[PDB]
């Protein structure tokens, strides 16, 4: 029954994020759509598992156990936020509030993950098809049909193929791949990471140069946050930053200041991120990452 206490905690978060003092923007990730849509897909799951055996098998499904826990954990966390923050949660620019945006981002990724792992409410994690063949092979060789793996084990296996240089690189990596922030990597999270920092063959070097050392890279930011941040640099066209698309997981969203002072965001589709950044740089659109002068040379990744 732990799914019932999870809904109560979620309902509270929603009820609590409905407080119109927040002036929340209907813009993905929008918590007032995400949490009820999550309860709904959870409804859809319980209804597809319609008798006691099916409910028993579900209760033993490892991914689902981790999911419901995470979701309790995270729902508890958002409640804790509002209790500790109180007044600060009405301040657009408080850290308590940024924390809530982060959590909204986490719920959005969790929502999309459950719709990929339980499409229509039926479990198909063991048949999730990884998008890239090299990454696919790798998940296969080490984890077969698992839907979800603990970080440490993921890390140990990854390291046998693509070596991690140090502890803090491992931590920066975890933080990049563990989008749901539950200290596990699902096949879905892995699909996303391997799409973002393709090709598989040079994957950690791609991440190193596109994320770990790149000033333009923004972790856990929204569309609205990108726009507000580049607003500071609107007198310096060519200012840009990039991040994970929230509504098109596995792809990047590039935000830039145009010559006329507009903030546009664009999503590469065929072109991998590095070519998009080389192409943009050379035509004057992507010159100043996060408003800064030094723009990393990415030509070596071709």
């Amino acid at each position: 029954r732990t799914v019932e206490k999870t809904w109560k905690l979620m309902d509270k978060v929603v009820r609590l994020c409905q407080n119109p003092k927040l002036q929340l923007k209907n813009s993905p990730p929008y918590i007032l759509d995400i949490l009820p849509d999550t309860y709904q897909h959870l409804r859809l799951i319980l209804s597809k598992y319609d008798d006691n055996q099916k409910l028993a098998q579900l209760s033993e499904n490892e991914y689902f156990k981790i999911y419901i826990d995470s979701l309790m954990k995270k729902s508890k966390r958002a409640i804790r936020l509002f209790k500790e923050g109180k007044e600060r949660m009405y301040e657009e620019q408080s850290q308590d509030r940024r924390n809530l945006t982060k959590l909204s981002l986490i719920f959005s990724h969790m929502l999309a993950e459950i719709k990929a792992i339980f499409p229509n409410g039926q479990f198909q994690g063991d048949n999730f098809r990884i998008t890239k063949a090299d990454a696919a092979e790798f998940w296969r060789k080490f984890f077969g049909d698992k839907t979800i793996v603990p970080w440490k084990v993921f890390r140990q296996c990854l390291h046998e193929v693509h070596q991690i240089s140090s502890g803090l690189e491992a931590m920066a990596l975890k933080s990049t791949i563990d989008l749901t922030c539950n200290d596990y990597i699902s096949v879905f999270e892995f699909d996303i990471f391997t799409r973002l920092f393709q090709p598989w063959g040079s994957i950690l070097r791609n991440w190193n140069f596109l994320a770990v050392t790149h000033p333009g890279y923004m972790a856990f930011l929204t569309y609205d946050e990108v726009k507000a941040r580049l607003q500071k640099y609107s007198t310096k066209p060519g200012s840009y930053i990039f991040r994970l698309s929230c509504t098109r997981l596995g792809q990047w969203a590039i935000g830039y200041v145009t010559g006329d002072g507009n903030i546009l965001q664009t999503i590469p589709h065929n072109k991998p991120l590095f070519q998009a950044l080389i192409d943009g740089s050379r035509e004057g659109f992507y010159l100043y990452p996060d408003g800064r002068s030094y723009n990393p040379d990415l030509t070596g990744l071709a």
Binding site: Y223, S245, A253, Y256, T258, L264, Q265, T266, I267, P268, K271, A276, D279, G280, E283, F285
Partner: peptide
Amino acid sequence: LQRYSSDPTG
């Protein structure tokens, strides 16, 4: 244009 726009380089 919408929320996300076209590649500026073409």
